[PDB]
Amino acid sequence: KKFPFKPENSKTTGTNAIPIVYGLSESQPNSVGGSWWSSSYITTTNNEQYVVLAHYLDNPVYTYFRASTLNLETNEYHQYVTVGSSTPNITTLDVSVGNNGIKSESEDNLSKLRSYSNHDNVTFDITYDATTGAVANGGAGTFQFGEGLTWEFGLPSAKTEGSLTVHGEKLAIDPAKSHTWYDRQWGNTAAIPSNWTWFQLHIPSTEYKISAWIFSDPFRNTETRFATIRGANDETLVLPLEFTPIYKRTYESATGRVTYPLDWKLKISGFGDFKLSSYTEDQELVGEDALQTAYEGFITFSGNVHSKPVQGYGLVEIVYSTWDV
Ligand SMILES: *[C@@H]1O[C@H](CO)[C@@H](O[C@@H]2O[C@H](CO)[C@@H](O[C@@H]3O[C@H](CO[C@H]4O[C@H](CO[C@H]5O[C@H](CO)[C@@H](O)[C@H](O)[C@@H]5O[C@H]5O[C@H](CO)[C@@H](O)[C@H](O)[C@@H]5O)[C@@H](O)[C@H](O[C@H]5O[C@H](CO)[C@@H](O)[C@H](O)[C@@H]5O)[C@@H]4O)[C@@H](O)[C@H](O[C@H]4O[C@H](CO)[C@@H](O)[C@H](O)[C@@H]4O[C@H]4O[C@H](CO)[C@@H](O)[C@H](O)[C@@H]4O[C@H]4O[C@H](CO)[C@@H](O)[C@H](O)[C@@H]4O)[C@@H]3O)[C@H](O)[C@H]2NC(C)=O)[C@H](O)[C@H]1NC(C)=O
């Protein structure tokens, strides 16, 4: 079956009625540091569907770019991680390891963006425009993440163009039936949680876009488990949830260090309940250490929102910042 991927056509910060704690443009450039990330839900001109990931991380120990493609008809999956050394402190967005990276193509560092990769098994060149109301995590764009603060916003349904090269054939992206979620996150500390799960959810019968985080805070000795939900008209919901990982189906990491569940239940307080399933077993970006490794998998789900049955899709991220303990 085909999914109803499609873009939004709205303003990035809506009315600006909600006083978020940064400007999006000013937060984009290399000099700010942190993480730049995109997941594109693509229909090509020949009606094939793919999910393509791109991710650049700056860290004081190293940098890396990592990327994957997933064919939704056949489950054919390809990934790589390539390690770099440093990030230039420039006042625009242009991060790369080799001939792969993420950059802005507009003066405001935000309105037109590009994720590109030229690996032999992972080759694409994807542009996307900020035509989608932002998700300001936590309500105003910041929340407690490990020992200190994190700052995060998502652009959930960006109009998307370009191409993906599959077995020597360059496939063109259909912008009427595609969209990209771009996520920008930068940080306060090196003491981030030991591991987490992050959900990025789309419910096509609604205007809700969900960015949900679950992890332990050993510094306050509490459990973080919440969703930031952007609705229509800039409305934002910050809601507790209950998280249940289900290990009936698992995928064993290629590093031998962890086992990933492949199904979950979420109960988001006052909003709805969901049953989520990884689309195929192997969706792991395999790096040399823990922070370079992640499960980044396309998922589908069913559930109920405000007593109405719903179906949807999105991505689950599973990260261990350390394999110790
Ligand atoms: C971030 O990463 C985290 C780590 O990967 C991850 O957390 C993990 O999540 C999973 C999924 O929820 C948890 O798995 C459950 O675990 C339950 C047991 O949990 C207890 O034990 C573990 C292990 O403790 C050992 O190991 C740790 C380190 O690994 C040590 O720190 C401990 O000291 C201890 O060490 C000893 O043992 C080791 C051997 O294992 C030795 O190596 C060692 O030397 C020592 O000898 C603890 O970590 C747990 O503590 C943590 O969690 C609790 C909350 O649960 C907190 O209170 C605590 O503070 C910690 O945070 C805890 O102590 C399993 O019981 C459970 O499986 C049952 O439930 C599922 C689902 O319902 C069933 O499918 C399953 O079949 C089991 O059901 C049976 O059993 C129950 C209970 O009796 C019955 O009610 C049920 O009906 C059924 O019984 C029937 O079937 C049985 C089986 O056939 C049968 O025997 C019966 O007779 C009956 O017929 C599930 O597997 C896992 O614990 C988490 N781990 C941690 C560390 O938290 C986290 O999700 C990630 N975060 C995110 C956001 O992604």
Keywords:
about 325 residues; mainly beta; AttH-like fold; 13-stranded antiparallel beta sheet; 8-stranded antiparallel beta barrel; 1 helix; about 0% helix; about 55% strand; globular; binds a molecule of 10 linked components (NAG-NAG-BMA-MAN-MAN-MAN-MAN-MAN-...); AttH-like_dom_sf; signal; AttH_dom; AttH domain-containing protein; Fungal_Dehydratase/Hydratase
Protein model, in words:
By secondary structure, this protein is mainly beta. The chain has one domain (about 25-320): Beta Barrel (AttH-like fold), CATH 2.40.370. It contains one helix and 22 strands. The strands form two sheets. Strands 1, 2, 3, 4, 5, 6, 7, 8, 9, 10, 11, 12 and 13 form a 13-stranded antiparallel β-sheet that branches. β21 and β22 (about 310-320) form a beta hairpin. The protein is globular, with a radius of gyration of 18 Å. It starts with about 25 loop residues before the first helix and ends in a 5-residue tail after the last strand. The relative contact order is 0.16. Bound molecules: a molecule of 10 linked components (NAG-NAG-BMA-MAN-MAN-MAN-MAN-MAN-...). A molecule of 10 linked components (NAG-NAG-BMA-MAN-MAN-MAN-MAN-MAN-...) binds near residues 195, 197, 214, 215 and 245. It is classed as lyase.
